[PDB]
Design a protein around this ligand. Structure first.
Ligand code: SF4
Lengths: 273, 325, 519, 609
């Protein structure tokens, strides 16, 4: 643990990115109660304004403050991304582990099922199902869908890992002395797979944010009067030519988030060589 | 060869046949096309509902509905939309429009990505690698719609600043162009510049990283050193002996990049106003119409599996460990 | 008022050149009276090539057209006889002289006495009694049965005159004008319709008794309404109506393109459902909700960078340009301190958040077209009603199903869509504003308004007809009928070389003078 | 005449994150035509760095100084497009690992054709391919015309090494550079490769620089030797002088710890303690000082120089006067006498009859078919007595490791009967199976894969104890006693495995196997893959443990020099059949079968006389 941490600590870009992500999450949840304008208030005397001394990041075509809208979009989008990444990693881990542990025709059938699921792009299937989830206050169902249709590409890596590590010598050595199978599982496989599961979650974070925001752009995701980042971008592109800030500010924020996530993922991966 | 390229085709046929079924039960469960005509405050008389449901086929279980759907699809009939118009009339045009874009985007993306990945893995940790591996990060970290809208903004700025219409970003072709094949072809390319560039950026971004990892793995082996120990130069041994052996893994990842391109084409088509399968899919899920979507998912599965099969042919042609053992 | 064409004298304008305009679809039927045939775009096309009796100034004032009818003059009042006299020197495109036969044929076709036709409406030719011979062959004399005030509405404005050979026999009217029009009398004549190429072309007429067009061709394309701005950028078409601020900004930053604005007669409005069963069933609640929505704010926010100082439209019959447009809006003033005060006194006391009668809650359904521009009005009305407790639930219906499934049969409590004013507005009423008559969705109406609507257009004097129409306007504002939100600021972006062509709003263009700026 | 190769003051230092490792520090030598010079040494001594620096194929971060002159023209600082004119046409390189030394997408005949086609430009492919077939015949690949179209994955390791040699000698070079060409090869294959190399040197007439770590190859191929330690030559003389009249103490230790088939069972070796120095930032003085059995303080002030000791003999030591004529045991002060074997128990602890194990072969990736039954285990009958050792010897593909791992599963095989301590494992319920696993424990092959990478040594050693019912008061004492028995310091009980050095990991593996005081150890090649000077220490440890405790081993190995030392009985295995058995001395001195004598004839012996 200590050597790994000080291996990551070395990666200045990765730690900077991770600190930026934590800062953005904390500010998204803690700053809005301090701003002069709430996200729902409408200021009809200042429409499409540049960043000024009253609306710190300007307003959109309706007079809504842009800062508060962006913060609420960040809340929704980042929370969904994190939750979906966690659930997808859990599902992928369980399926890949069982498939790679049983071996034989169970493994063949499970991997064939995974391929059959991968035959059609995941975005298409999610968009097909989404009419049911939409029109529902709880975002639980959207998270459940995004997680349940996004695990099939990493479960293959998990299965490769399980197969590779099941045959490694110290497992057989533990067998040859009377170590109970439960003790093997709690003591020999979990410590050696936990870190790579963490890495997988770190990348599925960005994957899920991308999927959810792309969904919201077309109108299938989060529906008004709630706002996600994709919704803000979709509204902004309507009047992007006249006043471009309304499109370029949320877009920039989104790109920043994604860059940070990707950087952290890569850094963490290269810190577990 | 023609025992690994045959058992690899029955597999694709079975996969497609089962996918075209599982994504019809999924569609017929998710979509309820009458949920708005059974909820109006002056709710219409029941006999209207029965007539509309019978006309739309939602009276028999899912299995019978799917059986009739296949019995008609194999005979070139694809049902009707929710407003009466047939699907077969539009299907050919939409397929053509989508394929024109996908082929160009994929070809340019994979070629550029392979070249950049090889260059980065050869010149590891030099300045060029450092700049390229972060440009790939940026391109991979911005969603498709952000890229498309930024390109539209840039094109508008360029047109306004220069003073003439350099770039066009609307429709597959421009209206009112009478002329021969050459005029129409130049016009078509003028429009094809940007939408295909949008997909090429993402494809190159992904394939650069994948190729860089593959070539790094190859450079960690000893046949390059052997090849240079016979008198080959560094470049001749790196290209003839090292790059070709690194090209093998790429032929297995092509069917994944193609799925990514299919996903991104929906956005590229919605934003630039192209009339293809992405626009049709958005229009089909917006109104919850079963036959449009049932055709689009079949087309998507077929295009992924075709790319997979061609990639497997390439992989057999390049790698001798499958032609003979 | 004050149309905003590039006023240049016709003589100095160069002789020749094309004029490439746009359409939305190839007209399946060319007959301009047949129900499918008629439309805004097709009527606009045929405007250039047909005869009309009256030409309307920038404010709806009608003056006789000396080209075609030397003098259309009413002569009596008890039977309402009007003497339409044809120009001595006038004939069709096939050389058959124009005579009263054409007038009689078209009046009979529009009469609806024999329902072998699909005429749009019998307005103006249902009250006709008899048109017969004059002193000379080139004069008709129309005697009416019920006195009429709008009588200029036939052979004028949006309705032109048709050849006798095409309106006499019912089969011809039904099915005749499908592949090109028949004879025409207008300074241009249609010469080619490349249905395979999606294009119409008009060319100078050989037999024009009047002036010479400063043009040569008005070739019409069929561009869809999305590649209509990006095709004025190229040299494909040179005219377009720009709607939003986005495309207004795009067009203004272009070489050779100038933006011209004179308010068009196209407004956009709320309408309330008064059928029994919906919440907006009673006069008082309907009239107290409308006193808690800011129309001035809705206008000033909706069209931000389209006009300067945008005020809403506050008259039901006349649009801003017309004459006789006084502010008829004193019954609702937006104050939420008289709205909320007779609202709770009415019996809708305030509960948690939104107020409710305890047997029901204020929830009002607001179906609107799914577009982005139409959503702003709903999102502003919703926020300005929330301060009163009226929860406005806004359902974004879209496209084709909006006027058939949901609006056409109640299925709504407040619906927003656009009407279209005209320089002859006295017929929009007795259609929309009455107990019966189609297009009165949300069947609100009273016996007195129906009694005072047959007196506004049984008059014989415009100076009094306008007063009666505005009294009707009082009667319709006074009972929660509908809220006229905005008037579209007709902005057309045209090639800066065009002259005597641009945004004229309600007024009518002169197709003999359009031409091109010299060189 | 300009000498064929002259290296002077060569120095090679890579660069890493921390200190720059100075791999080679100032060596110098000279190779003449028709002569063989062997650089001996082991672990990290910079032999391979010197080879790849002479050739020019060092990685792109290694920094090289000094002087290297090939027949007259210098090679350091030549551009790549100018140094590639010598490679292949005057230098022929043979590399270490054959299993990944050939590009896998070209037919081997085409790879030799490319070798012979780049340096002679106008040969024409029609002649290059014919010459490639001639070379394939010359090296000794069977029936070469057909095999000239075989991709590299369709050949065994010996075939691949033969193809690499064919590539090396394609253009008739003038200097061969062999970089451990016969490690990771079977014994007989290695003998054949040495014959091939001798034939290549005779036909070519070149001079060879062979880089080995074993002494038999040096005594059987080379003509002079240079012993390398810590990146410097420490002794250099003829092979006969080096084996007979060595002077540097490192050479004494290196030659005293090489097992010999001549030795009787139970003879101890002479292990050099410690581990080779880390080359990043040496301390001053002799690099051998930390491990030298004669080290005095003078040896620490300054580093000795390669000094002339005898006629054509140089030693880098200052106390050689005390090494001449003294046997390695005398210098290192060890007793190599085999202790008189006491009368042990003569009972039988393992007994296998007629054992057989099958393996199906399947062709087809997605769908598998049944075409053949390879019998890697066919009809084996062996047995083991108390206090003795039975060494199973065979080559790769002989089904000895699988026989061991089949015995260790303690289950009923397809045929034959397995007796362990008197219980026929077919009649063994799982309770008795758990009760018996406390009397036979296994020592694995790969030290680093047989240990949990992220567990302190205490946990690894106490795993058998914790899993079998010992309290936290007792496992502490038992683990403390075990570290002293094996040889590690108590202070290592809190150190992770990854920081131990090669031999200590195997020592920990032995300790873990030794926890429950079993009566049988099953050793699976646990000493190969180690430096010779560490093999000696572990071998002595095993012999002493058997002498003192009374253990019984089951020793599976591929080389026979140590099996002579350890095993009391032997069992030669061929393709899954035990072809010979009996007491070790009789089999190893008077063999009968043809395979056994082929095997014994193919083992090198470090006697050059
Ligand atoms: S010089 Fe000294 S330390 Fe070095 S090997 Fe000789 S005696 Fe040992």
């Amino acid at each position: 643990r200590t050597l790994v941490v000080r291996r990551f600590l070395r990666n200045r870009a990765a730690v900077a990115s991770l600190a930026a992500l934590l800062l953005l999450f904390v500010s998204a949840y803690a700053l809005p109660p301090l701003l002069p304008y709430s996200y729902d208030d409408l200021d009809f005397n200042a429409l499409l304004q540049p960043p000024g001394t009253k609306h710190w990041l300007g307003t959109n075509a309706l007079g809504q403050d842009l800062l508060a809208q962006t913060l609420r979009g960040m809340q929704k989008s980042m929370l969904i991304g994190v939750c979906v990444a966690v659930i997808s990693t859990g599902i992928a881990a369980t399926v890949g582990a069982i498939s790679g542990y049983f071996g034989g025709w169970r493994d063949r059938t499970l991997m064939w099922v995974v391929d059959l699921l991968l035959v059609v792009p995941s975005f298409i299937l999610i968009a097909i199902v989404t009419p049911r989830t939409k029109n529902s206050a709880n975002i639980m169902f959207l998270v459940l869908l995004l997680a349940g249709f996004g695990w099939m590409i990493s479960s293959r890596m998990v299965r490769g890992m399980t197969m590779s590590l099941r045959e490694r010598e110290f497992i057989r050595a533990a067998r040859y002395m009377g170590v109970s199978s439960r003790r093997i599982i709690v003591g020999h496989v979990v410590p050696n797979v936990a870190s790579i599961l963490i890495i997988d979650a770190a990348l599925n974070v960005a994957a899920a944010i991308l999927a959810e925001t792309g969904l919201s752009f077309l109108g299938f995701g989060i529906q008004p009067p709630d706002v996600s980042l994709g919704t803000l971008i979709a509204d902004g592109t309507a009047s992007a030519t006249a006043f471009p800030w309304v499109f370029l500010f949320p877009a920039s924020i989104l790109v920043l988030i994604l860059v940070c996530a990707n950087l952290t993922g890569d850094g963490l991966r290269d810190a577990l060589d | 060869m023609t025992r690994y390229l045959a058992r690899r085709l029955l597999n694709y046929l079975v996969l497609l046949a089962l996918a075209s079924f599982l994504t019809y039960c999924l569609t017929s469960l998710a979509f309820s096309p009458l949920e708005s005509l059974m909820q109006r405050s002056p709710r219409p008389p029941q006999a209207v509902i029965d007539a509309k449901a019978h006309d739309l086929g939602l009276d028999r279980p899912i299995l019978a509905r799917y059986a009739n759907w296949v019995s008609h699809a194999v005979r070139g009939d694809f049902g009707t939309t929710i407003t009466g118009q047939p699907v077969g009339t539009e299907l050919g045009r939409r397929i053509g429009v989508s394929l024109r874009l996908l082929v160009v985007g994929s070809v340019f993306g994979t070629v550029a990505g392979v070249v950049i990945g090889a260059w980065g893995a050869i010149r590891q940790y030099r300045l060029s690698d450092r700049v390229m591996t972060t440009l790939a990060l940026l391109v991979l970290s911005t969603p498709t719609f952000v890229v498309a809208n930024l390109l539209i903004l840039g094109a508008l700025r360029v047109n306004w600043a220069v003073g003439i219409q350099l770039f066009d970003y609307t429709g597959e072709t421009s209206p009112g162009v009478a002329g021969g094949v050459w005029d129409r072809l130049g016009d078509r390319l003028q429009h094809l510049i940007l939408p295909s560039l949008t997909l090429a950026l993402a494809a190159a971004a992904g394939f650069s990283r994948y190729q860089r990892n593959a070539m790094l793995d190859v450079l960690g082996q000893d046949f390059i050193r052997t090849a240079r120990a016979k008198g080959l130069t560094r470049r001749r041994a790196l290209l003839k002996h090292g790059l070709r052996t690194a090209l093998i893994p790429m032929a297995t990842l092509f069917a994944y990049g193609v799925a990514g391109l299919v996903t991104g084409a929906v956005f590229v088509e919605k934003i630039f106003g192209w009339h293809g399968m992405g626009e049709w899919m958005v229009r089909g899920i917006s109104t919850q119409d079963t036959n449009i979507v049932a055709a689009i998912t079949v087309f998507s599965g077929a295009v992924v599996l075709l790319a997979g099969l061609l990639s497997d042919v390439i992989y057999a042609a390049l790698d001798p460990r499958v032609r003979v053992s | 008022t004050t149309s905003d064409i590039n006023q240049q004298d016709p003589a100095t304008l160069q002789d020749g050149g094309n004029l490439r305009l746009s359409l939305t679809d190839f007209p399946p039927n060319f007959n301009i009276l047949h129900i499918d045939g008629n439309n805004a775009e097709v009527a606009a096309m045929m405007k250039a090539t047909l005869p009309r009796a009256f030409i309307i100034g920038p404010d709806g004032s009608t003056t006789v057209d000396t080209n075609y009818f030397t003098s259309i003059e009413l002569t009596r009042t008890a039977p309402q006889v009007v003497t339409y006299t044809i120009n001595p020197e006038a004939v069709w495109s096939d050389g058959t002289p124009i005579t009263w036969r054409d007038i009689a044929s078209q009046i009979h076709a529009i009469s609806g006495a024999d329902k072998a036709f699909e005429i749009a409406s019998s307005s103006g030719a249902e009250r006709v009694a008899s048109v017969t011979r004059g002193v000379d062959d080139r004069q008709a004399v129309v005697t009416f049965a019920k006195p009429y005030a709008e009588w200029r509405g036939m052979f004028a404005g949006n309705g032109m005159l048709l050849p006798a050979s095409m309106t006499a026999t019912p089969e011809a009217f039904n099915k005749g004008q499908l592949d090109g029009p028949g004879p025409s009398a207008g300074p241009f004549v249609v010469s080619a319709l490349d249905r395979t190429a999606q294009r119409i072309v008009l060319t100078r007429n050989p037999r024009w008794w009047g002036a010479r067009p400063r043009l040569d061709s008005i070739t019409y394309l069929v561009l869809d309404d999305a590649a209509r701005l990006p095709a004025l950028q190229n040299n494909t078409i040179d005219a377009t109506g720009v709607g939003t601020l986005d495309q207004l900004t795009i067009a203004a930053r272009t070489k050779g393109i100038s933006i011209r604005r004179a308010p068009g007669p196209s407004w956009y409005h709320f309408t309330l459902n008064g059928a029994p069963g919906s919440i907006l069933a009673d006069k008082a609640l309907r009239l107290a909700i409308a006193k808690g929505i800011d129309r001035y704010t809705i206008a000033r926010v909706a069209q931000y960078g389209l006009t300067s100082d945008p005020v809403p439209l506050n008259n039901h019959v006349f649009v801003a340009g017309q004459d006789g447009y006084q502010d008829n809006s004193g019954v609702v003033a937006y104050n939420p301190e008289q709205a909320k005060r007779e609202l709770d006194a009415l019996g809708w006391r305030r509960s948690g958040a939104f107020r409710e009668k305890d047997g029901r809650q204020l929830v009002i359904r607001d179906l609107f077209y799914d577009a982005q521009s139409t959503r702003q009005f709903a999102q502003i009305a919703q926020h300005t009603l929330a301060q009163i407790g009226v929860k406005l639930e806004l359902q974004a219906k879209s496209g084709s199903g909006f006027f058939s499934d949901y609006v056409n049969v109640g299925a709504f409590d407040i619906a927003q869509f656009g009407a279209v004013g005209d320089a002859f507005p006295l017929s929009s009423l007795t259609q929309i504003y009455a107990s019966d008559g189609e297009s009165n969705f949300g069947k609100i109406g009273s016996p007195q308004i129906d009694a005072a609507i047959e007196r506004t257009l049984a008059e014989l004097d415009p100076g009094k007809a306008r007063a009666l129409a505005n009294q009707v306007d009082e009667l319709i504002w006074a009972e929660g009928f509908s809220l006229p939100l905005t008037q579209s600021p007709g902005t057309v972006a045209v090639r800066s070389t065009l002259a005597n062509f641009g945004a004229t709003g309600l007024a009518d263009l002169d197709y003999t003078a359009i031409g091109f700026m010299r060189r | 005449m300009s000498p064929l190769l002259e290296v002077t003051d060569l120095a090679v230092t890579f660069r890493t994150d921390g200190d720059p490792v100075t791999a080679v520090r100032g060596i110098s030598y000279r190779v003449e035509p028709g002569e063989v010079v062997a650089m001996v040494g082991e672990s990290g001594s910079g032999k391979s760095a010197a080879a790849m620096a002479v050739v020019g194929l060092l990685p792109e971060y290694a920094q090289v100084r000094g002087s290297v002159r090939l027949q007259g023209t210098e090679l350091l600082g030549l551009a790549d497009n100018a140094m590639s004119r010598f490679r292949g046409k005057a230098i022929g390189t043979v590399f270490q690992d054959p299993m990944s030394a050939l590009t896998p997408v070209y037919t081997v005949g085409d790879q030799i054709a490319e070798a012979i086609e780049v340096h002679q430009p106008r040969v024409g492919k029609k002649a290059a391919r014919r010459r490639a077939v001639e070379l394939l015949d010359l090296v000794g690949i069977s029936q070469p015309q057909r095999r000239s179209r075989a991709f590299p994955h369709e050949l065994s390791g010996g075939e691949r090494q033969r193809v690499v040699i064919a590539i090396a000698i394609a253009n008739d070079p003038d200097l061969l550079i062999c970089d451990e060409p016969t490690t990771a090869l079977d014994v007989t294959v290695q003998a054949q490769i040495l014959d091939v190399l001798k034939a290549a040197r005779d036909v070519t007439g070149a001079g060879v620089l062979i880089i080995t770590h074993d002494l038999g190859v040096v005594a059987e191929f080379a003509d002079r030797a240079l012993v390398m330690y810590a990146g410097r030559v420490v002794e250099s003389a003829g092979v006969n002088d080096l084996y007979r009249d060595r002077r540097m103490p490192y050479t004494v230790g290196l030659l005293g710890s090489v097992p010999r088939l001549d030795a009787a069972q139970g003879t101890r070796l002479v292990p050099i303690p410690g581990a080779p120095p880390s080359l990043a930032g040496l301390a001053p003085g002799c690099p051998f000082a930390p491990r030298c059995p004669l080290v005095i303080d003078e040896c620490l002030t300054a580093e000795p120089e390669l000094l002339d000791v005898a006629t054509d003999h140089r030693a880098a030591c200052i106390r050689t006067e005390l090494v001449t004529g003294r046997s390695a045991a005398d210098i290192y002060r060890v007793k190599t006498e085999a202790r008189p074997a006491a009368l042990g128990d003569a009972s039988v602890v393992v007994r296998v009859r007629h054992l057989v194990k099958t393996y199906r072969l399947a062709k087809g990736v997605v769908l598998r078919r049944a075409i053949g039954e390879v019998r890697a285990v066919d009809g084996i009958s062996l047995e083991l007595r108390q206090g003795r050792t039975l060494g199973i010897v065979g080559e790769s593909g002989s089904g000895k490791s699988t026989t061991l791992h089949e015995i260790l599963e303690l289950a009923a095989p397809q045929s034959g009967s397995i007796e362990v301590l008197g219980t026929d494992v077919a009649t063994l319920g799982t309770a008795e199976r758990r009760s018996l696993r406390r009397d036979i424990q296994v020592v694995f092959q790969d030290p680093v894969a047989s240990l949990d990478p992220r567990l302190p040594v205490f946990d690894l050693i106490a795993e058998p104890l914790q899993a079998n019912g010992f309290g936290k008061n007792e496992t502490h004492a038992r683990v403390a006693e075990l570290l002293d028995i094996v040889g590690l310091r108590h202070g290592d009980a809190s150190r992770y495995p990854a920081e131990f050095s090669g031999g200590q990991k195997q020592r920990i593996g032995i300790a873990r196997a030794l926890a429950l005081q079993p009566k049988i150890l099953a050793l699976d090649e646990p000493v190969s893959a180690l430096d010779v000077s560490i093999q000696a220490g572990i071998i002595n440890l095993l012999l002493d443990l058997q002498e003192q405790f009374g253990l019984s081993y089951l020793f599976v190995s591929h080389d026979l020099s140590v099996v002579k030392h350890l095993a009391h009985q032997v069992a030669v295995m061929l393709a899954g059949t035990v072809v010979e058995q009996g007491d070790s001395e009789e089999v190893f001195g008077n063999p009968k079968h043809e395979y056994t004598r082929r095997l014994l004839g193919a083992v090198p012996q470090p006697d050059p006389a």
